[PDB]
Design a protein around this ligand. Sequence first.
Ligand SMILES: Nc1ncnc2c1ncn2[C@@H]1O[C@H](COP(=O)(O)OP(=O)(O)O)[C@@H](O)[C@H]1O
Ligand SMILES: Nc1ncnc2c1ncn2[C@@H]1O[C@H](COP(=O)(O)OP(=O)(O)O)[C@@H](O)[C@H]1O
Lengths: 436, 51, 35, 435, 66
Amino acid sequence: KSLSLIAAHSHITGLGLDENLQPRPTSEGMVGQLQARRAAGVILKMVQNGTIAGRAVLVAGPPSTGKTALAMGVSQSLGKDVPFTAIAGSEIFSLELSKTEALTQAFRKSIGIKIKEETELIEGEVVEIQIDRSITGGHKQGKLTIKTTDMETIYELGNKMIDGLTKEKVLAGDVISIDKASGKITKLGRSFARSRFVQCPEGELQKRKTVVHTVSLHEIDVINSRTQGFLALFTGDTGEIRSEVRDQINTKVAEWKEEGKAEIVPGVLFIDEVHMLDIECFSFINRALEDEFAPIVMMATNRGVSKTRGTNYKSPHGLPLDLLDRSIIITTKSYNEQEIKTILSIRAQEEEVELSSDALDLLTKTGVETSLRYSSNLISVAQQIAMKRKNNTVEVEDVKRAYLLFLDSARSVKYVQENESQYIDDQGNVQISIAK
Amino acid sequence: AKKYCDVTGLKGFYKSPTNNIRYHNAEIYQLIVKPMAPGVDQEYLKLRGAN
Amino acid sequence: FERADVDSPFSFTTFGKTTSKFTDLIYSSRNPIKY
Amino acid sequence: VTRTAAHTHIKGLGLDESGVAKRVEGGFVGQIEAREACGVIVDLIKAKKMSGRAILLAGGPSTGKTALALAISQELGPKVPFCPLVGSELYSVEVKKTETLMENFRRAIGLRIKETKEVYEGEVTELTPEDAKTISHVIVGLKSAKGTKTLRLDPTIYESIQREKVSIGDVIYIEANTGAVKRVGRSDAYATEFDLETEEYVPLPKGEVHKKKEIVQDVTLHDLDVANARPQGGQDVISMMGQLLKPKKTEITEKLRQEVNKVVAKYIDQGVAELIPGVLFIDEVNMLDIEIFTYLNKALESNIAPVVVLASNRGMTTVRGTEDVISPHGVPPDLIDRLLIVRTLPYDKDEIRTIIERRATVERLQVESSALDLLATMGTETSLRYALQLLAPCGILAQTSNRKEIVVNDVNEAKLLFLDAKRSTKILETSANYL
Amino acid sequence: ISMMGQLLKPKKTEITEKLRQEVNKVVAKYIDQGVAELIPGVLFIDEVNMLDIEIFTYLNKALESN
Ligand SMILES: Nc1ncnc2c1ncn2[C@@H]1O[C@H](COP(=O)(O)OP(=O)(O)O)[C@@H](O)[C@H]1O
Ligand SMILES: Nc1ncnc2c1ncn2[C@@H]1O[C@H](COP(=O)(O)OP(=O)(O)O)[C@@H](O)[C@H]1O
């Protein structure tokens, strides 16, 4: 499941921490930033305890210094069944939803409800189906022989089971699963009879299976609101859900919690590029954190003393001081040459690229010279130059060829500045002719 | 009429297709119902008059 | 070499298929996505 | 177990019977005058006589305004409506902002209805309709574990019965007042008619067939306005799939509100209903446009307007939507002429220490007394909220090293791991490339 | 519902990420069954200077998907 080619954070499998919340130097694909990893482990234990709500954590640092990778490590270490909503800053500027409504829907997608229920199923391999019908079809008599590897039985069939069996046509040798109460019959395939292919079930025919459901609060809000059905969870046109239905859902969840029929799980809402939000969104977030049904919010930004959007003054991190008073700030740092070399080694092993040692030294030098992401991007295009001349290992001259072909930012800025007459400036003045 | 297992007297969910004896679960079928001697099935069915 | 066939939309359905005096056919198309 | 989120150590204003605030009561530390003024406002709301009265409480950030509003809401009780609001929620893309303001105004006026629930349930043993093509009536005989009961029914309920595909031997559910019919399933006595079946089987109800109960319904005027003004039309009781046409919000006219008021005023005079006015609380009131501020003047002079409570933490600030209007707290002076202003004062050291101890007690944490003075000094040096939010990382770091008491090394470690706004700003100024 | 879907006027809607996750799961199952093959392609955006800062900030996130 979960198809994926290769991501930019695909080498991260979680936070590398021991039992005493101390970071290993290199574990689970994360290198360096020991204080940030320890703080994120503390935040992970805050989420896993689940006894407090509505805390804001800000991750700030220079660009391309492990900011989104920390959130990916936290999300991988969180595990399944716990919600994790990752949105961007500019995603809430909708055309059919207000900004506060989009923020409310993002907030209420990170709180789950755990419900455990048990059902009865009949799963086995069909041996023989005998159906007797009349001329007009008024009455039908049926016999079905079904089996597992441990038992054999024959069932006398009713009318509705006969109609549910001629629909979704089953034959001998099929493996099917029958729910008695709902009448849903699912064909799991054929058994191991050559005469898709599924091994025959074992044990008892009638098993009692318990499944654990995890339903977000937003789904119950959409379902309980009678204006739209459950299809609005897929089409997306919920359209400004009112507040009384949310109050009813909150009271009913609090009522279910006392009787033990349900459990509250909290999640993490991750807002990447939080500086793109407007001032009214910040004012809504200032009051959305003071509720019992609120998740733990992680925000990331790289702005330093920038202009707040929707205002005319400059604020630290692009955020007003009311939001900064409610938050605790984790600061990330820049990397040395050894961290860059280790990260490039991990990215080389992820992309199945064999690198020579001198090519790794050249990539580390051009990584500490210009950027980490440029040297990370150079590997996958140097491998194609390596394969073009029919060679497996990436050599020094392949990295030099990739450096010659694809430019970085600092060289392109200089090449623009020396030849400014050939490009369109801010005044729309360009020169296209070569002569004169 | 309610259906009961012929061996134990518990609730008989299933019924063997060979000798038409109702049984309760898999262990009764594997140990008693399937490797049973001939002629005992009719004496089992004699109790509820189904021979 | 190859024969042109029917131009039909791709059916994103799960239905009752046969794994082979009349025959009964009933509308049985469902969605693979289950909520 | 229990979830604590920035509040819920506040259980009330902590006043006595004479309205004099004790120093430590109800989870409140200090703030005598604002608590006494809020108690006077609570008494005025419980008087239930006046309409459209507005107050505003202003002060610095992190000083107790929202705590005072929630304490008022706890003091009034759950039967009185209380609609919390932020000033940025009025800007919707479906209707105008004045319509949203009037909707939130009418969401804060409640009603109490005395009702009676009557329920028949049990196994069907007899279903004999009688005509005079039109059925005159139908006789249904129910059965439970305590006996049977025979009921007559009009054909309207019979149509709902044949909607539900009810036969002999099914367990049903009939509401007497509303005529609702629900089929639960087939009885367990008919579980052996077939070996394999589609019907689900349920046991007989152990209680009596006939059950009676007294219930109290709480509604608001906005719910009646919504229910009387559906644009597409009515809806069924069960609709798992929505309508084909999407119904959006509409500008509800004054005529519908007048007719709803007439119907409710007719129902009140018979003793059926009871009118409970409530509180509309708007936090961050400086995020309102000048047009909403102008329409608030008209809305506060109505005959059915509730008590409005506003909060703001601005000083002399320009009003949003204008260019050269400077007024205190970001509120225009023509509105400012209509409210009463309650001042809210900041805190000194010992109340900060006592609040930190209270939040440590609520969060079930044990703090040494040596670490408490350092936490209070940290709170006075940087922020109260920074000291309050640092308790749980301190508890987690103490629990990691198998300790159940906060040691000042954990406070130093949590100070080193997590920064405040001022140290982050000092990092921002002394840096080269975008932090 | 499927009959009435052909008669109404079509309109673009904000497709939620839940539907995309379900479609990805079904496509991954089809690939695992051996009846499907994935062909990634090229998206070409000419005159990129007409975009503003919000689309650029969303593109920063969207390039980091898998
Ligand atoms: N500690 C680390 N371990 C592994 N990879 C890292 C680490 N720090 C940065 N990276 C890599 O550097 C790239 C940029 O990281 P990211 O935090 O996403 O950028 P930004 O700081 O602009 O958000 C990512 O692709 C990530 O794989
Ligand atoms: N007198 C008090 N006693 C106990 N806690 C208080 C008191 N005053 C304020 N607090 C706490 O300090 C915080 C101030 O928050 P809030 O009142 O929302 O800030 P603002 O006044 O800027 O809206 C709240 O979490 C509240 O619990």
